Design an enzyme around this catalytic site. Structure first.
Site, PDB file in Angstrom:
ATOM      1  N   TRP A 104       4.204 -13.417  -9.047  1.00  9.76           N
ATOM      2  CA  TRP A 104       5.233 -13.627  -8.034  1.00  9.76           C
ATOM      3  C   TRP A 104       4.948 -12.861  -6.739  1.00  9.76           C
ATOM      4  CZ3 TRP A 104       9.734 -12.475 -11.978  1.00  9.76           C
ATOM      5  CH2 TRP A 104       9.739 -13.491 -12.942  1.00  9.76           C
TER       6      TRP A 104
ATOM      7  N   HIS B 187       0.823  -1.207   0.000  1.00 13.17           N
ATOM      8  CA  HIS B 187       0.000   0.000   0.000  1.00 13.17           C
ATOM      9  C   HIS B 187       0.861   1.262   0.000  1.00 13.17           C
ATOM     10  CE1 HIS B 187      -4.171  -1.662   0.626  1.00 13.17           C
ATOM     11  NE2 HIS B 187      -3.429  -2.731   0.860  1.00 13.17           N
TER      12      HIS B 187
END
Ligand code: HEM
Ligand SMILES: [Ca+2]
Ligand SMILES: [Ca+2]
Length: 329
Positions: free
Chosen positions: A164, A47
């Site tokens: 990934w 974030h």
């Protein structure tokens, strides 16, 4: 170099991280565990870092989500980033490094506590955040695959790099997707860094845990597990499906790619040649616990294979009958 207590490290600037490691291990991670606090701090690195666009602005991993919490914490996409930020703030104020550095440092340490986890490279010297992140830079679970790949692409990530990074959902729960069932994990082993996430998202869905009509939720194959709409679509989209499947029963790849791409993420908006390598501070993760498996009662036919070039690997199912998954304590 040799630091205050005799502990050593390559670069002397890194010495300041030693007492910070000790504090956060005891006082943030509940005795160096791989639980909620680690999960929360791992989420936070994303974030923070993802607030970066060459077009739209944002300083990438610069700690702006902490320094400008008031603003960013109140973006729709940052729902439930409250507690994490409020939890790390005293450590940031108390300690010796920038918020950008602390966010990534804690995330890396946190990951090193999880069984099967990997050491994420860590660099020191991010300056204080300049301004808040612009809105619309954080992907949401109800965003289409094209929106998600475009945003991550805009930030600097290829489709396979996205897959990934989503290995992070191997150690992850949800509180706001379905508020009726807080702490519901994305896979069966939320306290282990493994491939169960990539396996279990590929299974045919069976029910909605909790309530049935939530934004960004689709049917999960397991009671006590939640499936994001986005993860469901990413496991099946031709751009990501084969790479997704490649993660299954592939611990070394999962560890390698996660460490590589996390370091790239942590450097968004930054310059490696203008930081100090403090990677040797990151502890050694515990070895992987358990092996790749289908949930009990399941078989290969319950997998919705979506990789056109390569068939889904042979996995056995856990001994016994179908069972639920506890919410994350
Ligand atoms: C790419 C698109 C992504 C989407 C749409 C997405 C979405 C979500 C959602 C909806 C939650 C649950 C939040 C809640 O309701 O409490 C979550 C949790 C989490 N996310 Fe992702 N995510 C993405 C990628 C990533 C990446 C790149 C990371 C890198 C570290 C990450 C790390 C985590 C972690 C560790 C949690 C668990 C938090 C906890 O258990 O307290 N996610 N994600
Ligand atoms: Ca940021
Ligand atoms: Ca797991």
């Amino acid at each position: 170099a040799t630091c205050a207590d005799g502990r050593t490290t390559a670069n002397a600037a890194c010495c300041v991280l030693f007492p910070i490691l000790d504090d956060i291990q005891e006082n943030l991670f509940d005795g160096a565990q791989c639980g909620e606090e680690v999960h929360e701090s791992l989420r936070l690195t994303f974030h923070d870092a993802i607030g970066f666009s060459p077009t739209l602005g944002g300083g990438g991993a610069d700690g702006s989500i902490i320094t400008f919490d008031t603003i960013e914490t109140n973006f729709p996409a940052n729902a439930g980033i409250d507690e994490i930020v409020s939890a790390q703030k005293p450590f940031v104020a108390k300690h010796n490094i920038s918020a950008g550095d602390f966010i990534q440092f804690a995330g890396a340490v946190g990951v090193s506590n999880c069984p099967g986890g990997v050491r994420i490279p860590f660099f020191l010297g991010r300056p204080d955040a300049v301004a808040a992140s612009p809105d619309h830079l954080v992907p949401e679970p109800f965003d289409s695959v094209d929106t998600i790949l475009a945003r991550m692409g805009d930030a600097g990530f290829s489709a396979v790099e996205v897959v990934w990074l989503l290995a992070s959902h191997s150690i992850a729960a949800a509180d706001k997707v379905d508020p009726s069932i807080p702490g519901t994990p994305f896979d069966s082993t939320p306290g282990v860094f493994d491939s169960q996430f990539f396996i279990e998202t590929q299974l045919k869905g069976r029910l909605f845990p909790g309530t049935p009509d939530n934004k960004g939720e689709v049917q999960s194959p397991l009671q006590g597990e939640i499936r994001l709409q986005s993860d469901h679509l990413l496991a099946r989209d031709p751009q990501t499906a084969c790479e997704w499947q490649s993660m299954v029963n592939n611990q070394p790849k999962i560890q390698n790619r996660f460490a590589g791409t996390m370091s790239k993420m942590a450097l968004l908006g930054q310059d490696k040649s203008k930081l100090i390598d403090c990677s040797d501070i990151i502890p050694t993760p515990p070895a992987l616990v358990g092996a790749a498996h289908l949930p009990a009662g399941f078989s290969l036919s319950d997998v919705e294979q979506a990789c056109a070039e390569t068939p889904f690997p042979a996995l056995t199912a856990d001994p016994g009958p179908v069972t639920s998954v506890p919410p994350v304590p």
